């Protein structure tokens, strides 16, 4: 792929994090804490979930951004409308508002309803999104293997700004701490 050259510099929301959620000074880092980080709720947090927001908004032209999954076992990582729902259980769809792909128990997935099933020969250490507002594309790319395509979203219904969406996911089994980075350009 040739999408490197629509490179945008994201930076995480912290009002939109989950309580439990540690953003690094920089805002290009995210892990899960141990315990409640010591935050006021509001209604923008995700309360059912590791997840937080991008703080950018698009609703035109091509982006292309980076994240580093290096080390862990479950995560979730695409876009999602401004508006979706923040409180209480939801899968993750296009119904739903949500262009995603994840890792879960060793399988790769596809956030379509159902999921569908990635084809991954090498485990991505990095992930590289890109989105095409106007064409109503989100596709996700395997840095690790030259740049390999893993799945594209065609056909999309954006319906409202879009946002960058993470999960650095649960940790239960203790292997899961690591964060997820974003990239430098
Ligand atoms: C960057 N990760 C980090 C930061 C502070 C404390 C512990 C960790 S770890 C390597 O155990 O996930």
């Given at each position: 792929h040739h999408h490197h050259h629509h490179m945008?510099?994201?930076?995480?929301?912290?009002?939109?994090?989950?309580?439990?959620l540690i953003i690094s000074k920089d805002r290009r880092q995210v892990r899960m804490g141990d315990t409640h980080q010591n935050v006021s709720d509001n209604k923008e947090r995700f309360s059912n979930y590791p997840m937080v927001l991008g703080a950018q908004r698009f609703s035109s032209g091509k982006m292309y951004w980076e994240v580093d999954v290096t080390q862990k076992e479950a995560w979730?990582?695409?876009?999602?409308?401004?508006?979706?729902?923040?409180?209480?259980?939801?899968?993750?769809?296009?119904?739903?508002?949500?262009?995603?792909?994840?890792?879960?128990?060793?399988?790769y997935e596809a956030g379509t309803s159902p999921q569908t099933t990635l084809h991954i020969q090498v485990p991505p250490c990095q992930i590289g999104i890109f989105v095409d507002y106007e064409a109503g594309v989100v596709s996700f790319y395997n840095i690790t293997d030259h740049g390999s395509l893993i799945y594209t979203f065609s056909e999309c219904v954006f319906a409202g700004p879009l946002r960058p969406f993470f999960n650095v996911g649960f940790n239960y089994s203790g292997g899961n701490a690591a964060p997820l980075k974003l990239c430098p350009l």
């Open positions: 945008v510099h994201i930076t995480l929301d912290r009002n939109t994090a989950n309580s439990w979730d990582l695409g876009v999602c409308r401004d508006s979706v729902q923040r409180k209480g259980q939801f899968s993750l769809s296009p119904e739903n508002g949500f262009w995603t792909i994840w890792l879960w128990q060793d399988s």
